[PDB]
Amino acid sequence: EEDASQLIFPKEFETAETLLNSEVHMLLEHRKQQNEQELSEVFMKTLNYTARFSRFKNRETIASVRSLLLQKKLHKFELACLANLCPETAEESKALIPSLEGRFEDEELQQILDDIQTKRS
Template identity: 75%
Template sequence: MAGFNPVDMVEEDAADLQFPKEFENAETLLISEVHMLLEHRKNQNESSEEEQEFSEVFHKTYTYTNEFRKFRNKETIASVRSLLMQKKLHKFELAALGNLCPASPEEAKALIPSLE
């Protein structure tokens, strides 16, 4: 296969914090933050003179984030992110902890193996 270089292939494994290079500069969001962004977009649309129809994906994502968000207001979301950022966590670990909200360190390590 022309142009194929096995050295370029990195084994992807979130447990070892190995992600594709496309994710190097990507930021992670909590589900609550995604919901807040979608809510803002929805409110903007409703207050605009020419209301646009949202896609099915938008509606499904909005419903999902509404169901699974852990935090309901901007201040709480900011506090959670700020507290987690004080720890030396990979951005994936930060988002996973903020989304899963494990009840104990043992549960956190079981759900997010890279925390070991």
């Protein structure tokens, strides 16, 4: 019954806040910087994964795409996966996230995707 395709999630987990792969890369690198008992192999396999997929690396550049998206009608679930995937076209964003089908028109949605790609190093 719990399906991310249509946004149905647990009662205690709807109040949770999402994070980007770079955003957790900064938090986990900061915790490794403090601690180096040792870190677990679950911590190690989340560093190397979230490193390979950290698509843009300044934090401050997130807050514009966050503030405009809550000025649109998207959820905080899309706010992080559309910054982890880094999709090209609005037709790809609706194909990856089925919750975007009918939620916006393509040419308005495409403008946000072009705004995200600019931050990449």
